Amino acid sequence: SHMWIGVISLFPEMFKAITEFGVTGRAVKHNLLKVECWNPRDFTFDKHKTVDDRPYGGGPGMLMMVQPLRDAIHTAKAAAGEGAKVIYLSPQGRKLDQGGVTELAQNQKLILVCGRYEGIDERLIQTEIDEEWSIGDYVLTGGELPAMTLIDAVARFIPGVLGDGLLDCPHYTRPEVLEGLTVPPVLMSGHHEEIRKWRLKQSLQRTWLRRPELLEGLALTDEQRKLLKEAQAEHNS
Amino acid sequence: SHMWIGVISLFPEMFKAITEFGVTGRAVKHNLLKVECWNPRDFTFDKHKTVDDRPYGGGPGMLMMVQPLRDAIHTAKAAAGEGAKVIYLSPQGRKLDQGGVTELAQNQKLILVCGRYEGIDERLIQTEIDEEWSIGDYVLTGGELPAMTLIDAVARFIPGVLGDGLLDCPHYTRPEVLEGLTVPPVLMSGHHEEIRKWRLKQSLQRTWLRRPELLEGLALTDEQRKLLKEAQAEHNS
Ligand SMILES: NC(=O)c1ccc(NCC2CCCC2)nc1
Ligand SMILES: NC(=O)c1ccc(NCC2CCCC2)nc1
């Protein structure tokens, strides 16, 4: 179930951050994940390899120049063959969450278009882009970090890359006592069922306290309902 | 108003993605932004430079080993001096948005702790971390991409790095006609006020259609109320 991701970027060397390091670097070396980049600058024809252009209507910014970007996209589409979804990363896109990650991970091929400057021509979005996605409600200097974020997130779903809507439970490792703070005795008990229930209760409690809206989106099991009620009762002393 | 950011990461070379390229790369070269990394592996003492450890209570994963990570954090804190806020990036943190970015950008010094494996010891969060932040409701293989995302976002607020709660308007550049699609005539009119109002109306319309909840958080001006009503009337034909 390997995955191919084509990238359109003025700064393809940025993607070394995910292709050369850690779990995603291993995925690439083991051919579980392939990331292939095209740079609009390589598709320019003028002496100074111009990749930006002035916005109609004026304004302080520049846009990506249409012809080099369009040609790079077309080249990526030809390399991908049939079935590749083309994604543009921008704050105007659908907000990414883990459900959206699972949806995107169903694709065997993606092409990610990374904007720079003030963005890209709206008509390219209409004619070349299948979906717009955002990694969050904030503005960055380029689409490369959003693209890498998406790649990393979906790569976790590729079989072989790694070894319920709630926040994670607390985790502990050595030493047993750290600046006077002890490990919860249950985690030392060797009682697997008690440990499982403790972790679940902690996850429910943390989700309730920090992100209560996330709970509203869940259909809690009988056990989860019980443990959440216990946690809420204890919180209220 | 330059900014110093200390980073704790097992993969410091990942940060070349922001320190060597584009607007953030320029910020670094021009001394507007300094990014300084410490690697827990450099703080190990065993032959194999062990940086992970087993979780109490069992489970399939590993945590970052406490001693090398703690020592790296302390070294970063000493380098930062007084006033540095220590941030841990994780899905359990406060969700980043542009308002949160503006808040974080008020700090002259930040230290960003990048988790790997299944995370870090809860007691380190208690004893070493000032704030936990998330870049979005999804899970990544490491905190480095979230840290770089945060750095890029806050760097845009540093004076010299660059040259209202609504989504951006559409942008257009050459050519005048692209695959049969024309540039809106108003943007060619040279009428600056008409162009301003068009862009604002488009932003209001796009926010309403794609992200209506964002509108609920705004106190629209009289002009914005009018243009939004116009856009909604036109949408309803
Ligand atoms: N939240 C996001 O997913 C996101 C995506 C792209 C971006 N910036 C580059 C785009 C902004 C103008 C040029 C393209 N910033 C933020
Ligand atoms: N949404 C986020 O801001 C985010 C942060 C860190 C992360 N992964 C590394 C952490 C997860 C376990 C080890 C540390 N994933 C996602």
From Swiss-Prot, chains A, B:
Broad enzyme group: transferase
Swiss-Prot/TrEMBL catalytic activity: guanosine(37) in tRNA + S-adenosyl-L-methionine = N(1)-methylguanosine(37) in tRNA + S-adenosyl-L-homocysteine + H(+)
Positions bound to S-adenosyl-L-methionine: Y88, G115, I135, G136, D137, Y138, V139, L140
Main localisation: cytoplasm
Compartments in which it is found: Cytoplasm
A single Gene Ontology CC term: cytosol
Disulfide linkage: none
Gene3D superfamilies tied to this protein: 3.40.1280.10, tRNA(m1g37)methyltransferase, domain 2 (1.10.1270.20)
Record's subunit section: Homodimer.
Family under the similarity heading: Belongs to the RNA methyltransferase TrmD family.
Entries under PANTHER family matching the protein: TRNA (GUANINE-N(1)-)-METHYLTRANSFERASE
Protein name as it appears in the record: tRNA (guanine-N(1)-)-methyltransferase
Source species of the chain: Haemophilus influenzae (strain ATCC 51907 / DSM 11121 / KW20 / Rd)
Gene from which the chain derives: trmD
